[PDB]
Amino acid sequence: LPESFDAREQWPNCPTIKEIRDQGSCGSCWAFGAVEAISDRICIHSNVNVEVSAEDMLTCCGGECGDGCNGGFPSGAWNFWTKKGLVSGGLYNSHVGCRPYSIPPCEHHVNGSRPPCTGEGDTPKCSKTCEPGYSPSYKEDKHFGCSSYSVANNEKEIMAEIYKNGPVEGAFSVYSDFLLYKSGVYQHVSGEIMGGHAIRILGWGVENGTPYWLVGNSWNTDWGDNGFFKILRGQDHCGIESEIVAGMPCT
Numbered sequence: 319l320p321e322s323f324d325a326r327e328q329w330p331n332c333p334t335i336k337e338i339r340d341q342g343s344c345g346s347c348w349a350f351g352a353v354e355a356i357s358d359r360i361c362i363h364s365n366v367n368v369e370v371s372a373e374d375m376l377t378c379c380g381g382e383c384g385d386g387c388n389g390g391f392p393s394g395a396w397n398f399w400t401k402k403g404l405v406s407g408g409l410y411n412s413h414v415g416c417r418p419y420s421i422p423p424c425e426h427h428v429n430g431s432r433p434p435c436t437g438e439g440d441t442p443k444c445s446k447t448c449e450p451g452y453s454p455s456y457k458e459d460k461h462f463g464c465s466s467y468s469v470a471n472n473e474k475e476i477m478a479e480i481y482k483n484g485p486v487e488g489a490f491s492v493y494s495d496f497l498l499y500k501s502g503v504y505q506h507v508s509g510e511i512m513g514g515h516a517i518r519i520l521g522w523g524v525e526n527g528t529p530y531w532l533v534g535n536s537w538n539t540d541w542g543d544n545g546f547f548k549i550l551r552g553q554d555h556c557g558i559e560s561e562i563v564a565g566m567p568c569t
């Protein structure tokens with residue numbers, strides 16, 4: 319394996335790999351990390367570009383994935399993809415795809431032009447219909463996964479998985495000091511625990527001798543390093559290597 323790897327550069331024909339979404343005032347990171355990586359993998363393994371609907375995942379999976387805006391289980395999300403499939407759907411108010419995200423973007427622990435996020439957000443309804451004007455039908459717009467698996471808490475295996483099959487979804491414990499991240503390799507040193515957080519790992523590297531994972535957060539682009547962040551790699555820091563999940567698209 320190379321010392322560094324950036325899925326954005328390795329798969330130039332898959333722009334979803336470079337995009338950063340906004341989960342809004344809803345604890346739907348479990349769903350976002352999943353649909354983002356799935357969007358990447360659909361492009362990687364069928365090179366078609368599709369913005370997989372975070373809305374479809376968040377609202378229609380149900381108990382199998384957890385509790386909607388109240389948090390969920392990443393591996394459960396990839397299972398839904400293989401069982402029920404996922405329709406397309408872009409950013410809030412984009413009118414892109416079958417089911418665009420219905421929760422407004424907001425400021426995540428930063429100041430900006432958008433309204434500040436409010437932890438309190440309800441899970442939208444599971445509507446099995448597409449926005450007006452979009453074709454095909456909800457059922458016909460479903461994209462299915464053909465496998466859903468968990469990658470071992472092993473740095474090399476995780477790197478190999480990414481290197482070969484594309485970005486994966488992961489999760490780690492968020493402490494308050496992470497909220498103010500701007501640059502460099504994040505290492506937890508202080509702050510009360512905020513809870514678990516699911517994200518998308520799309521690569522790795524070494525900064526000033528410090529090995530790290532290249533991660534895409536779902537708190538919009540004005541948070542962190544243009545929406546991305548780097549976190550210590552190799553020591554299961556904050557459990558970043560403990561809950562890696564992925565899957566492969568059908569044909």
Ligand SMILES: *[C@]1(C(=O)N[C@H](C(=O)N[C@@H](C)C(=O)O)[C@@H](C)CC)O[C@@H]1C(=O)OCC
Nearest residue numbers: 345346347348389390426489512513514516
């Ligand atoms: C993942 C999650 O979404 N976490 C919360 C979050 O992202 N909040 C946004 C609105 C923000 O700007 O902080 C929050 C706890 C993180 C600080 O609870 C879900 C989940 O399913 O976690 C399990 C992996």
